[PDB]
Design a protein around this ligand. Structure first.
Ligand code: M77
Lengths: 18, 340
């Protein structure tokens, strides 16, 4: 699912600016 | 009604430009405060809950190490953030109460917003319902209308950067990437998930990048995940510029139509960048039930009120290793930070 792909991205935590 | 908006924004610009041209400096000092707890930590800076000794009022004090700021090439950004914060005035922008500097650090003392970041609430709850998302979205719309009328591009919208106050309303706090420009600008900055395609594509861009980020924000609030994600930013960038986007099946028809017009790769067709400006957004069907004036006046009942024991309650923030605030015997970087 889209949610599962989100979890698998490893980008579920707080995101830093570039 | 539109005449009231123009007159309001004209007064707002006049008040802003006055403070912008003559900023406040040195309105407190460090030993006026007791340190309570660290609320946030990152590059070059920490934010701490502090208590003003004379009054007992709690504040959030951002502390920047001048040498770390210089090392990370953040001088102009830091000076600019403080200059913006002391000059703006809007219900959803955090208020700067005091600022000062010493040998080692710069200090910005802001109103303490006890409900925490929207990010944690969103990840905890999973996703927000559409009325819940719309309540927050309406505040960002008004905030960008205000900021853009001042020729300020915000450029750092994300749930991590939105605080929830005691009444459940949003406070925007970080202005390190904001820029006052009327034309175009070229800096690659922001967070991958929220970058507009024209930023990714190294074009000169304008305030329409904030309306794109609004679409990302609305999508993530309503779905629980952003519209474009991947293992690595480069792969996120490819999705963003691709012009393709998929919606969860529970998204309403009005919501999808709004998002297609905000997540619009073509600048000539993105909402907020057209002839009627923000009114294309405020008049969209998804916002039909939104009382814009009542939102601004904070008279709408918030759909979520954070837990708040009392003044100085920090339960909505994470735990961090408490570190010393060291003030060096030698003044560091004095010439660089004269205007602070
Ligand atoms: O929550 S903060 O520590 C914070 C900053 C500024 C003012 C604050 C006011 N109250 C609480 C926390 C505050 N923070 C903002 C969110 C994004 N990361 C940077 C730091």
């Amino acid at each position: 699912t889209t949610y599962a792909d989100f979890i698998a991205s490893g980008r579920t935590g707080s995101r830093n600016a570039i | 009604e539109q005449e009231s908006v123009k007159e309001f924004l004209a007064k707002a610009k006049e008040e802003f430009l006055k403070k912008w041209e003559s900023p406040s400096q040195n309105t407190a000092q460090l030993d006026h405060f007791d340190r309570i707890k660290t609320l946030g930590t990152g590059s070059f800076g920490r934010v701490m809950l502090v208590k003003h000794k004379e009054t007992g009022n709690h504040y959030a004090m951002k502390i920047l190490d001048k040498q770390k700021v210089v090392k990370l090439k953040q001088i102009e950004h830091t000076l600019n953030e403080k200059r913006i914060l002391q000059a703006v005035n809007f219900p959803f922008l955090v208020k700067l109460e005091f600022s000062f500097k010493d040998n080692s650090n710069l200090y910005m003392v802001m109103e303490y917003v006890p409900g925490g970041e929207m990010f944690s609430h969103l990840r905890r709850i999973g996703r927000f319902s559409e009325p819940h998302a719309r309540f927050y979205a309406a505040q960002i719309v008004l905030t960008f209308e205000y900021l853009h009328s001042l020729d300020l591009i915000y450029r750092d919208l994300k749930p991590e950067n939105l605080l929830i106050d005691q009444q459940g309303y949003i406070q925007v706090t970080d202005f390190g990437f904001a820029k006052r420009v009327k034309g175009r600008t070229w800096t690659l900055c922001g967070t991958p998930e929220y970058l507009a395609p024209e930023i990714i594509l190294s074009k000169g861009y304008n305030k329409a990048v904030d309306w794109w980020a609004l679409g990302v924000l609305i999508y993530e609030m309503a779905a629980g995940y952003p519209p474009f994600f991947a293992d690595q930013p480069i792969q996120i960038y490819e999705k963003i510029v691709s012009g393709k986007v998929r919606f969860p099946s529970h998204f309403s028809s009005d919501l999808k139509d709004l998002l297609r017009n905000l997540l619009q790769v073509d600048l000539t067709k993105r909402f907020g960048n057209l002839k009627n400006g923000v009114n294309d957004i405020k008049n969209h069907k998804w916002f039909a039930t939104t009382d814009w004036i009542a939102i601004y006046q904070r008279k709408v009942e918030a759909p979520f009120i954070p837990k708040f024991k009392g003044p100085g309650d920090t339960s909505n923030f994470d735990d961090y290793e408490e570190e010393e605030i060291r003030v060096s015997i030698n003044e560091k970087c004095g010439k660089e930070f004269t205007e602070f």
